[PDB]
Design a protein around this ligand. Structure first.
Ligand SMILES: CC(C)Oc1ccc2c(=O)[nH]c3sccc3c2c1
Lengths: 195, 198
Protein backbone atom coordinates (compact mmCIF):
# COMPACT_ATOMS: atom_id res chain seq x y z
CA UNK A 1 0.00 0.00 0.00
CA UNK A 2 2.90 2.41 -0.93
CA UNK A 3 1.77 6.10 -1.21
CA UNK A 4 0.79 7.59 -4.64
CA UNK A 5 3.34 10.51 -4.42
CA UNK A 6 6.23 8.02 -4.05
CA UNK A 7 8.02 7.54 -7.39
CA UNK A 8 8.64 4.07 -8.90
CA UNK A 9 11.43 2.08 -7.18
CA UNK A 10 12.10 -0.57 -9.94
CA UNK A 11 10.92 -3.32 -7.45
CA UNK A 12 13.40 -2.08 -4.72
CA UNK A 13 12.21 -1.70 -1.06
CA UNK A 14 14.39 1.38 -0.13
CA UNK A 15 15.16 4.61 -2.06
CA UNK A 16 16.09 8.22 -1.10
CA UNK A 17 14.57 10.56 -3.78
CA UNK A 18 15.93 14.13 -4.07
CA UNK A 19 12.94 16.52 -4.49
CA UNK A 20 12.78 18.97 -7.45
CA UNK A 21 12.97 22.56 -6.06
CA UNK A 22 9.95 24.79 -6.87
CA UNK A 23 7.52 21.84 -7.23
CA UNK A 24 4.56 21.49 -4.80
CA UNK A 25 6.00 18.72 -2.51
CA UNK A 26 9.42 20.46 -2.08
CA UNK A 27 7.68 23.86 -1.44
CA UNK A 28 5.34 22.28 1.19
CA UNK A 29 8.26 20.72 3.18
CA UNK A 30 10.51 23.82 2.71
CA UNK A 31 7.67 26.06 4.12
CA UNK A 32 7.25 23.83 7.27
CA UNK A 33 11.01 24.32 7.94
CA UNK A 34 11.31 28.06 7.01
CA UNK A 35 8.32 28.83 9.35
CA UNK A 36 11.01 28.85 12.16
CA UNK A 37 14.35 28.33 10.24
CA UNK A 38 14.18 31.06 7.50
CA UNK A 39 17.82 32.13 8.31
CA UNK A 40 19.14 28.61 7.29
CA UNK A 41 20.09 27.66 3.67
CA UNK A 42 18.49 24.42 2.30
CA UNK A 43 20.96 22.39 0.14
CA UNK A 44 18.41 19.62 -0.60
CA UNK A 45 15.27 17.79 0.57
CA UNK A 46 15.07 13.99 0.03
CA UNK A 47 11.89 11.85 0.20
CA UNK A 48 12.53 8.66 2.26
CA UNK A 49 10.88 5.66 0.50
CA UNK A 50 11.32 2.77 2.97
CA UNK A 51 8.58 0.16 2.21
CA UNK A 52 9.18 -1.97 5.39
CA UNK A 53 9.24 1.04 7.81
CA UNK A 54 6.12 2.47 6.07
CA UNK A 55 4.26 -0.91 6.33
CA UNK A 56 5.09 -1.31 10.08
CA UNK A 57 4.15 2.37 10.77
CA UNK A 58 0.82 2.14 8.83
CA UNK A 59 -0.12 -1.02 10.86
CA UNK A 60 0.54 0.92 14.11
CA UNK A 61 -1.53 3.89 12.75
CA UNK A 62 -4.50 1.58 11.91
CA UNK A 63 -4.24 0.04 15.45
CA UNK A 64 -4.03 3.49 17.16
CA UNK A 65 -7.04 4.77 15.08
CA UNK A 66 -9.07 1.69 16.37
CA UNK A 67 -7.79 1.94 20.00
CA UNK A 68 -8.41 5.73 20.34
CA UNK A 69 -11.75 5.59 18.37
CA UNK A 70 -11.41 8.21 15.55
CA UNK A 71 -8.86 10.96 16.59
CA UNK A 72 -6.12 12.36 14.34
CA UNK A 73 -3.29 10.42 16.10
CA UNK A 74 -0.58 11.71 13.69
CA UNK A 75 1.64 14.88 13.85
CA UNK A 76 4.41 16.06 11.47
CA UNK A 77 7.46 16.81 13.68
CA UNK A 78 11.23 17.43 13.33
CA UNK A 79 14.24 15.37 14.45
CA UNK A 80 17.79 16.73 14.22
CA UNK A 81 20.58 14.13 14.13
CA UNK A 82 24.32 13.78 13.34
CA UNK A 83 25.52 12.71 9.84
CA UNK A 84 26.78 9.29 11.18
CA UNK A 85 23.17 8.34 12.33
CA UNK A 86 21.53 9.26 8.93
CA UNK A 87 22.12 5.88 7.13
CA UNK A 88 20.72 3.92 10.15
CA UNK A 89 17.60 6.18 10.45
CA UNK A 90 16.92 6.04 6.67
CA UNK A 91 16.95 2.17 6.80
CA UNK A 92 15.78 1.37 10.38
CA UNK A 93 13.95 4.53 11.64
CA UNK A 94 14.21 5.80 15.23
CA UNK A 95 15.62 3.56 18.01
CA UNK A 96 15.26 4.62 21.70
CA UNK A 97 18.22 2.27 22.53
CA UNK A 98 20.63 4.66 20.62
CA UNK A 99 20.18 8.39 21.62
CA UNK A 100 19.26 14.39 27.60
CA UNK A 101 16.16 12.17 28.35
CA UNK A 102 14.40 14.69 30.67
CA UNK A 103 10.88 13.46 29.64
CA UNK A 104 11.70 9.71 29.35
CA UNK A 105 13.90 7.11 27.60
CA UNK A 106 12.33 7.41 24.12
CA UNK A 107 12.91 9.18 20.79
CA UNK A 108 12.40 13.00 20.88
CA UNK A 109 10.60 15.02 18.15
CA UNK A 110 10.23 18.86 18.03
CA UNK A 111 7.13 20.87 16.97
CA UNK A 112 9.48 23.62 15.59
CA UNK A 113 12.39 23.01 13.16
CA UNK A 114 14.27 25.77 15.14
CA UNK A 115 14.51 23.36 18.16
CA UNK A 116 15.97 20.47 16.05
CA UNK A 117 18.26 23.04 14.23
CA UNK A 118 20.33 23.42 17.48
CA UNK A 119 23.89 22.05 16.92
CA UNK A 120 23.36 19.67 19.96
CA UNK A 121 20.81 17.75 17.76
CA UNK A 122 21.62 18.52 14.07
CA UNK A 123 25.42 18.38 14.68
CA UNK A 124 27.22 20.17 11.78
CA UNK A 125 29.53 17.71 9.88
CA UNK A 126 33.13 18.61 8.70
CA UNK A 127 31.54 20.70 5.83
CA UNK A 128 29.08 22.62 8.13
CA UNK A 129 26.13 20.55 6.74
CA UNK A 130 23.30 19.87 9.26
CA UNK A 131 20.61 17.14 8.93
CA UNK A 132 16.97 17.17 10.11
CA UNK A 133 14.13 14.69 9.42
CA UNK A 134 10.50 15.61 8.90
CA UNK A 135 8.75 12.73 10.72
CA UNK A 136 5.19 11.34 10.79
CA UNK A 137 4.74 10.61 14.54
CA UNK A 138 1.83 8.70 16.16
CA UNK A 139 1.53 11.10 19.17
CA UNK A 140 -2.07 9.88 19.78
CA UNK A 141 -3.33 10.71 23.30
CA UNK A 142 -0.51 12.31 25.31
CA UNK A 143 0.37 13.38 28.88
CA UNK A 144 3.26 15.25 30.55
CA UNK A 145 6.48 13.18 30.66
CA UNK A 146 9.15 12.95 33.41
CA UNK A 147 12.74 11.62 33.74
CA UNK A 148 13.19 7.82 33.77
CA UNK A 149 9.95 6.75 31.94
CA UNK A 150 10.58 3.60 29.77
CA UNK A 151 6.93 3.66 28.43
CA UNK A 152 4.23 6.37 28.60
CA UNK A 153 2.22 6.41 31.87
CA UNK A 154 -1.13 4.54 32.13
CA UNK A 155 -4.27 6.65 31.31
CA UNK A 156 -5.58 5.45 34.75
CA UNK A 157 -3.43 3.49 37.28
CA UNK A 158 -6.53 1.21 37.91
CA UNK A 159 -5.80 -0.32 34.40
CA UNK A 160 -1.97 0.03 34.36
CA UNK A 161 -1.51 -1.59 30.84
CA UNK A 162 -3.80 0.92 28.97
CA UNK A 163 -1.06 3.52 28.18
CA UNK A 164 -0.86 7.05 26.76
CA UNK A 165 0.57 6.90 23.19
CA UNK A 166 3.30 9.53 23.88
CA UNK A 167 4.49 12.15 26.40
CA UNK A 168 5.23 15.88 26.02
CA UNK A 169 6.91 18.78 27.90
CA UNK A 170 3.55 20.66 28.11
CA UNK A 171 0.07 19.22 27.35
CA UNK A 172 -1.62 22.65 26.73
CA UNK A 173 1.16 23.98 24.38
CA UNK A 174 3.50 21.08 23.43
CA UNK A 175 6.92 21.83 21.87
CA UNK A 176 8.28 18.23 21.94
CA UNK A 177 6.93 14.66 21.94
CA UNK A 178 8.63 11.43 23.09
CA UNK A 179 7.58 7.98 21.74
CA UNK A 180 8.76 4.72 23.32
CA UNK A 181 8.07 2.06 20.63
CA UNK A 182 9.46 1.13 17.21
CA UNK A 183 6.73 1.65 14.54
CA UNK A 184 5.50 4.98 16.04
CA UNK A 185 7.61 7.33 13.81
CA UNK A 186 8.17 7.31 10.01
CA UNK A 187 11.08 9.46 8.75
CA UNK A 188 9.38 11.01 5.64
CA UNK A 189 11.91 13.71 4.50
CA UNK A 190 15.59 14.51 5.18
CA UNK A 191 16.56 18.24 5.00
CA UNK A 192 20.28 18.96 4.40
CA UNK A 193 20.94 22.64 5.37
CA UNK A 194 23.57 25.13 6.72
CA UNK A 195 23.56 28.02 9.29
CA UNK B 1 -7.21 -11.62 9.62
CA UNK B 2 -6.37 -13.71 12.75
CA UNK B 3 -5.63 -17.49 12.83
CA UNK B 4 -8.84 -19.53 12.18
CA UNK B 5 -8.33 -21.89 15.19
CA UNK B 6 -8.41 -18.91 17.68
CA UNK B 7 -11.62 -18.58 19.77
CA UNK B 8 -14.06 -15.90 18.50
CA UNK B 9 -13.24 -12.77 20.60
CA UNK B 10 -16.54 -10.98 19.68
CA UNK B 11 -14.87 -7.79 18.21
CA UNK B 12 -12.43 -7.59 21.24
CA UNK B 13 -8.66 -7.36 20.65
CA UNK B 14 -7.27 -9.63 23.42
CA UNK B 15 -8.13 -12.94 25.21
CA UNK B 16 -6.28 -15.68 27.20
CA UNK B 17 -7.67 -19.17 26.31
CA UNK B 18 -7.18 -22.02 28.82
CA UNK B 19 -6.10 -25.22 26.95
CA UNK B 20 -7.38 -28.73 27.80
CA UNK B 21 -4.92 -31.56 28.59
CA UNK B 22 -5.39 -34.35 26.00
CA UNK B 23 -5.64 -31.82 23.11
CA UNK B 24 -2.55 -31.95 20.76
CA UNK B 25 -2.07 -28.17 21.33
CA UNK B 26 -1.70 -28.58 25.16
CA UNK B 27 0.30 -31.86 24.91
CA UNK B 28 2.98 -30.49 22.46
CA UNK B 29 3.69 -27.50 24.77
CA UNK B 30 3.67 -29.79 27.84
CA UNK B 31 6.14 -32.19 26.07
CA UNK B 32 8.40 -29.28 24.86
CA UNK B 33 8.50 -28.06 28.52
CA UNK B 34 8.87 -31.51 30.21
CA UNK B 35 11.82 -32.38 27.85
CA UNK B 36 14.05 -30.27 30.24
CA UNK B 37 11.62 -29.42 33.18
CA UNK B 38 10.35 -32.92 34.26
CA UNK B 39 10.88 -31.95 38.00
CA UNK B 40 8.18 -29.16 37.75
CA UNK B 41 4.38 -29.62 37.31
CA UNK B 42 2.18 -27.50 34.97
CA UNK B 43 -0.87 -25.85 36.59
CA UNK B 44 -2.29 -24.57 33.26
CA UNK B 45 -1.38 -23.47 29.69
CA UNK B 46 -3.11 -20.41 28.18
CA UNK B 47 -3.12 -19.50 24.47
CA UNK B 48 -2.48 -15.70 24.11
CA UNK B 49 -4.78 -14.13 21.46
CA UNK B 50 -3.46 -10.55 21.07
CA UNK B 51 -4.72 -9.20 17.71
CA UNK B 52 -2.43 -6.10 17.56
CA UNK B 53 0.77 -7.92 18.68
CA UNK B 54 -0.02 -10.73 16.17
CA UNK B 55 -0.55 -8.22 13.29
CA UNK B 56 2.74 -6.31 13.97
CA UNK B 57 4.69 -9.59 14.47
CA UNK B 58 3.35 -11.23 11.24
CA UNK B 59 4.27 -8.02 9.27
CA UNK B 60 7.87 -8.28 10.63
CA UNK B 61 7.91 -12.04 9.75
CA UNK B 62 6.72 -11.38 6.14
CA UNK B 63 9.50 -8.71 5.85
CA UNK B 64 12.21 -11.07 7.16
CA UNK B 65 10.87 -13.92 4.92
CA UNK B 66 11.23 -11.50 1.89
CA UNK B 67 14.66 -10.13 3.00
CA UNK B 68 16.27 -13.53 3.84
CA UNK B 69 16.96 -16.35 1.31
CA UNK B 70 14.33 -19.13 2.00
CA UNK B 71 15.47 -19.14 5.70
CA UNK B 72 13.50 -20.70 8.60
CA UNK B 73 13.35 -17.27 10.34
CA UNK B 74 11.12 -18.35 13.28
CA UNK B 75 11.96 -20.50 16.35
CA UNK B 76 9.66 -21.41 19.26
CA UNK B 77 11.55 -20.37 22.43
CA UNK B 78 10.94 -19.89 26.18
CA UNK B 79 10.91 -16.72 28.32
CA UNK B 80 10.64 -16.88 32.14
CA UNK B 81 9.22 -13.79 33.87
CA UNK B 82 7.93 -12.48 37.23
CA UNK B 83 4.15 -12.33 37.96
CA UNK B 84 4.27 -8.47 38.03
CA UNK B 85 5.38 -8.44 34.29
CA UNK B 86 2.69 -10.90 32.98
CA UNK B 87 -0.18 -8.35 32.42
CA UNK B 88 2.21 -5.98 30.45
CA UNK B 89 3.69 -8.86 28.32
CA UNK B 90 0.19 -10.30 27.57
CA UNK B 91 -0.94 -6.83 26.31
CA UNK B 92 2.33 -5.30 24.93
CA UNK B 93 4.87 -8.11 24.35
CA UNK B 94 8.60 -7.96 25.16
CA UNK B 95 10.13 -4.52 25.79
CA UNK B 96 13.99 -4.55 25.65
CA UNK B 97 13.88 -1.32 27.79
CA UNK B 98 12.51 -3.46 30.75
CA UNK B 99 14.90 -6.49 30.27
CA UNK B 100 17.27 -7.52 33.13
CA UNK B 101 21.05 -7.91 32.60
CA UNK B 102 21.52 -11.68 31.85
CA UNK B 103 24.13 -13.59 33.98
CA UNK B 104 25.98 -14.17 30.64
CA UNK B 105 25.23 -11.09 28.46
CA UNK B 106 25.36 -11.34 24.63
CA UNK B 107 23.79 -7.87 24.27
CA UNK B 108 21.20 -5.45 25.72
CA UNK B 109 18.00 -7.02 24.38
CA UNK B 110 15.22 -9.48 25.24
CA UNK B 111 16.51 -13.04 25.97
CA UNK B 112 14.78 -16.26 24.78
CA UNK B 113 15.87 -19.82 25.78
CA UNK B 114 15.96 -22.99 23.61
CA UNK B 115 15.47 -25.12 26.81
CA UNK B 116 12.54 -24.58 29.26
CA UNK B 117 15.06 -25.56 32.07
CA UNK B 118 16.91 -22.22 31.49
CA UNK B 119 13.70 -20.09 31.73
CA UNK B 120 12.59 -22.28 34.76
CA UNK B 121 15.41 -20.78 36.93
CA UNK B 122 14.02 -18.66 39.84
CA UNK B 123 16.13 -15.71 38.50
CA UNK B 124 13.85 -15.61 35.36
CA UNK B 125 10.51 -17.27 36.38
CA UNK B 126 10.41 -15.77 39.92
CA UNK B 127 7.97 -17.78 42.11
CA UNK B 128 5.04 -15.48 43.13
CA UNK B 129 3.61 -15.25 46.71
CA UNK B 130 1.63 -18.50 45.93
CA UNK B 131 4.66 -20.46 44.59
CA UNK B 132 3.52 -20.11 40.94
CA UNK B 133 6.23 -19.69 38.26
CA UNK B 134 5.40 -18.21 34.79
CA UNK B 135 7.05 -19.02 31.44
CA UNK B 136 6.03 -17.77 27.96
CA UNK B 137 6.33 -19.93 24.83
CA UNK B 138 7.27 -17.40 22.15
CA UNK B 139 7.49 -17.25 18.33
CA UNK B 140 10.84 -15.44 17.84
CA UNK B 141 12.19 -14.07 14.51
CA UNK B 142 15.80 -15.30 15.03
CA UNK B 143 16.40 -15.01 11.25
CA UNK B 144 20.15 -14.90 10.43
CA UNK B 145 22.19 -14.79 13.67
CA UNK B 146 25.78 -14.56 14.96
CA UNK B 147 27.45 -14.83 18.40
CA UNK B 148 26.49 -11.72 20.39
CA UNK B 149 28.61 -9.56 22.75
CA UNK B 150 27.73 -7.62 25.93
CA UNK B 151 28.12 -4.14 24.31
CA UNK B 152 25.36 -4.60 21.62
CA UNK B 153 22.20 -2.36 21.68
CA UNK B 154 21.33 -3.63 18.11
CA UNK B 155 22.42 -6.83 16.31
CA UNK B 156 25.82 -6.28 14.68
CA UNK B 157 26.29 -5.70 10.94
CA UNK B 158 26.96 -8.75 8.73
CA UNK B 159 29.72 -6.67 7.05
CA UNK B 160 31.78 -3.96 8.82
CA UNK B 161 31.82 -1.80 5.60
CA UNK B 162 27.97 -1.82 5.47
CA UNK B 163 27.01 -0.86 9.05
CA UNK B 164 23.18 -0.73 8.41
CA UNK B 165 22.76 -4.31 6.98
CA UNK B 166 22.18 -6.19 10.28
CA UNK B 167 21.95 -9.75 11.61
CA UNK B 168 18.34 -10.41 12.77
CA UNK B 169 19.42 -11.70 16.24
CA UNK B 170 22.44 -12.91 18.26
CA UNK B 171 23.10 -16.14 20.18
CA UNK B 172 25.55 -17.48 22.82
CA UNK B 173 26.98 -20.06 20.32
CA UNK B 174 26.18 -20.34 16.53
CA UNK B 175 27.09 -24.12 16.41
CA UNK B 176 24.93 -25.03 19.51
CA UNK B 177 22.55 -22.10 20.20
CA UNK B 178 20.90 -22.17 23.69
CA UNK B 179 19.72 -18.52 23.86
CA UNK B 180 18.75 -15.77 21.40
CA UNK B 181 18.64 -12.00 21.95
CA UNK B 182 16.38 -9.67 19.90
CA UNK B 183 16.69 -5.88 19.89
CA UNK B 184 13.43 -4.70 18.22
CA UNK B 185 9.70 -4.51 19.09
CA UNK B 186 7.36 -7.05 17.41
CA UNK B 187 10.23 -9.57 16.73
CA UNK B 188 8.69 -11.93 19.35
CA UNK B 189 5.03 -13.01 19.76
CA UNK B 190 4.06 -14.37 23.23
CA UNK B 191 1.97 -17.38 22.12
CA UNK B 192 1.43 -19.42 25.35
CA UNK B 193 1.71 -18.70 29.09
CA UNK B 194 2.68 -21.77 31.18
CA UNK B 195 1.85 -21.46 34.91
CA UNK B 196 3.78 -24.14 36.89
CA UNK B 197 4.92 -25.14 40.43
CA UNK B 198 7.53 -27.38 42.13
C1 LIG C 1 14.28 18.32 25.73
C2 LIG C 1 15.06 17.75 24.58
C3 LIG C 1 15.86 16.54 25.01
O1 LIG C 1 14.13 17.42 23.50
C4 LIG C 1 14.55 17.19 22.21
C5 LIG C 1 13.93 17.86 21.14
C6 LIG C 1 14.33 17.64 19.85
C7 LIG C 1 15.37 16.72 19.57
C8 LIG C 1 15.83 16.47 18.21
O2 LIG C 1 15.37 17.05 17.23
N1 LIG C 1 16.83 15.54 18.01
C9 LIG C 1 17.42 14.87 19.04
S1 LIG C 1 18.71 13.71 18.86
C10 LIG C 1 18.71 13.45 20.56
C11 LIG C 1 17.81 14.23 21.24
C12 LIG C 1 17.03 15.08 20.36
C13 LIG C 1 15.99 16.04 20.65
C14 LIG C 1 15.55 16.28 21.97
Amino acid sequence: NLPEHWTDMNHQLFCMVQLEPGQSEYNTIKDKFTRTCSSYAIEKIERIQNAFLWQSYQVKKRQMDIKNDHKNNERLLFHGTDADSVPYVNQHGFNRSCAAVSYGKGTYFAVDASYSAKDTYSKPDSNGRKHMYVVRVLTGVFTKGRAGLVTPPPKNPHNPTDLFDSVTNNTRSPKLFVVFFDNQAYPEYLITFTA
